[PDB]
Structures are given as C-alpha cells and as structure tokens.
C-alpha cells in the first residue's frame, strides 16, 4: 500500500529544572504502524544529578476503520535505563515496561462519538531499586462533540492504577482519577488545543493527595510541505502556597516531518 513515514524531535522542560530531549520515527502501511523512540530526562543544570533514558518500540494494528466503528491495538516495549548519582547503594538500573493497549472510536450520532484507549502494563527487573509497582492499568475514555470542521470538544475520564502481582509488595501502588477536557480548534494551517485536567481523586504510597489541576495550551503549525512544528505550555498545581505540592511548570517544542511513498 502507501508507505507513510514520520521523523521528529522534541524538547521538554519541567520545574517547580528537568530537561527532556527526545527523537522518534514511525512507518505505516495498510493496518500496520511501527514506531521507534528515544527519550532522556535529567536536571537542567546537569553539580549534576540522576537521569535516565527511555528507548521504546511500539507496534500498532488497525482491526477496523470506518465511520461507525474503528478499533486497534498497540503493543510496546520500553527500557528505563537509570543512572543514579549520590544515593547509597546502586549506580545504574534497567527496568522494562511491556504494554498492550486497545483503542476504539464509535459513532453515537452525526456529531457525537465515544472513544478511548486502555493500557495494561507489566514492569520487569530492578523494581526494588526503581520503586515501581509491577502491574498497572491506564485508561482515557469519553465523548467527542464536533461543532464543525474547525471546532470539537472532548471530555474524558482518566484512571491510572498501580497493583502488585507479587502480593507481598505494596511498592509503587497508587490510584489517580481525572476529568480531562480539550477543545481542538483547526484554523487553516494553525492548530490550537486548550486543555484542562481536574483531579477527581488520588491516593499513593508517597502520601500527592487531594485536588490537582492542570491547564495547558497546544499550538501547532503545518507548512503544507511535510514539515510541522509544535509549542505547548502547561501549568499544574495543588492549591499553591500551603496546599501541598503547590506549582509546576511545563514547556515543550516539537518538529515533525511527514513524507510518503507508493
Ligand atoms: C493542551 C493539550 O496538550 N492539548 C492536546 C494536544 N494534542 S496533540 O496535538 O496530539 C499533542 C501535541 C504535543 C504533545 C502531546 C502530548 N504529550 C504528552 C506531549 C500528549 C497528547 C497530545 C499531544
Ligand atoms: C530506518 C530509518 C530511520 C531514519 C531516522 C533518523 C532519525 C530519527 O531517529 C529515529 C530512531 O528512533 C530511536 C531508535 O531507538 C533508539 C535505541 O536506543 C538504544 C540505546 O541503548
Ligand atoms: O519478569 C521478567 C520479564 O517478563 C516479561 C514478560 O511480560 C510480558 C507481559 O505481557 C505482555 C503481553 O502478554
Ligand atoms: C456543547 C457541548 C454539548 C453537546 C451536547 C450534544 C447533544 C446533542 O444531542 C441532543 C441531546 O439533547 C439533550 C441535551 O444534552 C446536553 C448535554 O449537556 C450540555 C452541556 O452541559
Ligand atoms: C469545556 C466543558 C467542560 C465542562 C466539564 C467539566 C467537568 C468537571 O467535573 C469535575 C467534577 O469534579 C468533582 C469533584 O470530585 C470531588 C468530590 O468531592 C468528594 C470528596 O468528599
């Protein structure tokens, strides 16, 4: 069929600093898509501190794609390669993550749709060092009302939960529930998505713990020649000042190149 390829890169920054460069490549033909990525995370002022890398391979299969009903499945693999500095015990660790994730999209109306994905994760190796729960489920699922070709609203429920198959561990065991709202606007070559996340409930073993809000803004531009760029800002908080975990800032820049064959 037609071979569709993308290459791209991104740089993300977080603080209350973390610098996070990443690269990716994906390739698609008929129902099959394969994706490779490399991500790294560590202090802005690398003094210096703990960092890690995150090579990843994902494969996607589209079972069905049409107006009334679409569904597909992702399988993935990550290694998390940790390089500890200043911390009695270890110096490096490797933890793998295995992912199986169905996705779906079903029409309820000419303007209303039900869509989502669900993910099942296993984490293997060096879990004692790294603190993770060995099992995890993640889902974002909900409704999309389309106003017109320019504007759509999406309101999703989001759950992530951590479990331990090894019933003698509570390491990395948490729960998080959110409502997440988006308003993707398409304005010629410009894309703008305002988004919100409202904590419904969260508990974890590091307490985290009550009402956690995020507001953000994605800006995208397509040059109509294969190239596109992205810029995103996000602000997260608990309730500031005393509250408990107050403020967090996120900024990200990306470039994608899209080219085809056949
Ligand atoms: C406010 C907001 O983020 N809205 C959704 C963005 N949609 S997108 O264009 O697919 C996009 C762009 C850049 C990053 C994105 C992430 N990241 C976790 C970085 C996640 C989903 C979409 C997305
Ligand atoms: C096969 C042609 C691809 C050409 C793409 C060039 C630039 C984009 O890079 C995408 C590759 O993605 C990362 C690959 O996986 C990294 C493996 O890291 C292992 C380190 O231990
Ligand atoms: O622990 C050792 C490694 O085990 C990895 C196998 O787990 C794969 C999880 O299954 C995903 C799809 O079946
Ligand atoms: C602006 C987002 C609301 C889109 C609602 C789409 C419903 C179209 O079918 C008509 C159903 O009539 C019942 C009204 O339900 C409205 C839902 O609540 C409105 C937003 O709070
Ligand atoms: C752009 C349209 C967006 C409108 C939909 C927003 C819906 C947000 O709903 C959030 C519901 O929050 C419930 C709060 O949950 C905590 C309840 O208190 C329990 C503790 O006793």
Domains defined for the chain, CATH in brackets: 1-262 (2.40.160.40)
Q: Which residue has the tokens 């693999």?
A: 77
Ligand 3 centroid to Cα of residue 98, in Å, is: 6
* DSSP 8-state symbol, 151: B
Check if the beta carbon of residue 53 is closer than 8 Å to that of residue 81: yes
Angle at alpha carbon of residue 174, lines to 245 and 39, rounded to 5°: 75
Q: What is the DSSP string of 58-107?
A: EEEEEEE-SSSEEEEEEEEEEEEEEE--S-SS-SEEEEEEEEEEEEEEEE
Position in ligand 5 atom list of the atom nearest CA 183: 1
Contacts 24+ apart (CB under 8 A), 3-6: 3/27, 3/28, 3/29, 3/260, 3/261, 3/262, 4/28, 4/29, 4/258, 4/260, 4/261, 5/258, 5/259, 5/260, 5/261, 6/256, 6/257, 6/258, 6/259
Say how many residues make up the chain: 262
The CA 17 to ligand 4 mean position distance, Å, reads 42
Evaluate: CB of 155 within 6 angstroms of ligand 5.
Answer: yes
Name the nearest CA neighbour of 95 among 119, 120, 127, 121: 127
Kindly identify the ligand whose nearest atom is closest to the C-alpha of 25.
Answer: 2
Find the discontinuities in the chain where C to next N exceeds 2.5 angstroms and give the residue preceding each: 16, 46, 207
Using alpha carbons, list the distances in angstroms from residue 230 to 60, 146, 150, 203, 220.
24, 23, 18, 33, 4
Give yes or no for a contact between 21 and 46, defined as CB atoms under 8 angstroms apart.
no
Residues having CB closer than 6 A to ligand 2 are 7, 23-25, 36-38, 55
Contact of 238 with 232, CB cutoff 8 Å = no
* CA–CA dist 152, 99 (Å, integer): 29
- Decide: 15 and 248 in contact? Cβ < 8 Å: yes
Q: Is the CB of 145 under 6 A from ligand 4?
A: yes
Q: Is 210 helix (H, G, I), strand (E, B) or coil?
A: coil
Q: Give 199 Cα–ligand 5 centroid separation in angstroms.
A: 8
Percentages of the chain per state (helix, strand, coil), in multiples of 5: 0, 70, 30
SS3 128: helix
Give the separation between CA 114 and CA 71, rounded to whole angstroms.
12
Pocket test for ligand 3, best of 122, 132, 134 (most atoms within 8 A of CB): 122
Q: Residue 105 pairs with which residues in a beta bridge?
A: 70, 115
Determination approach:
X-ray
Torsion of CA 39, 42, 43, 46, to 10 degrees: -100
Q: Please report the atom of ligand 3 found closest to the CA of residue 124.
A: 1
Answer for the pair 112, 152: CB distance below 8 angstroms, yes or no.
Answer: no
d(CA 59, CA 100): 10
Resolution of the determined structure in angstroms stands at 2.4
Nearest CA to 210 out of 180, 242, 243 is that of 243
Choosing from 181, 185, 210 the residue with most ligand 5 atoms within 8 A of its CB, the one to mutate for a pocket test is 181
Q: Which residues line ligand 3 (CB under 6 A)?
A: 98, 100, 122, 124
Burial (CB < 10 A; 0-12, 13-18, 19+), residue 134, is buried
């Amino acid at each position: 069929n037609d071979w569709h390829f993308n290459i791209g890169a991104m740089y993300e920054i977080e603080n209350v600093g973390l610098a996070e460069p990443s690269v990716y490549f994906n390739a698609a033909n008929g129902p099959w898509r394969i994706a490779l990525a490399y991500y790294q995370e560590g202090p802005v002022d690398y003094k210096r501190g703990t960092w890690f890398d995150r090579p990843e391979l994902e494969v996607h299969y589209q079972f069905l794609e049409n107006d009334d009903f679409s569904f597909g499945l992702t399988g993935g693999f990550r290694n998390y390669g940790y390089h500890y500095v200043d911390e009695p015990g270890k110096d490096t660790a490797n933890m793998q993550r295995w992912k199986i994730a169905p996705d779906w999209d079903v029409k309820l109306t000419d303007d209303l749709r039900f869509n989502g994905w669900l993910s099942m994760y296993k984490f293997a190796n060096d879990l004692n060092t790294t603190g993770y729960a060995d099992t995890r489920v993640e889902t974002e699922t909900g409704l999309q009302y389309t106003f017109n070709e320019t504007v759509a609203l999406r309101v999703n429920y989001y759950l992530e939960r951590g479990f331990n198959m090894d019933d003698s561990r509570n390491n990395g065991e948490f729960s998080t529930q959110e409502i997440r709202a988006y308003l993707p606007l398409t304005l010629g070559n410009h894309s703008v998505t305002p988004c919100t996340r409202i904590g419904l409930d969260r508990w974890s073993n590091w307490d985290e713990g009550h009402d956690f809000n995020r507001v953000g803004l994605f800006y995208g531009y397509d040059f109509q020649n294969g190239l596109s760029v992205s810029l995103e800002y996000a602000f997260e908080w608990q309730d500031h000042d005393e509250g408990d975990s107050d403020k967090f800032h996120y900024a990200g820049v990306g470039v994608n190149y899209s080219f085809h064959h056949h």
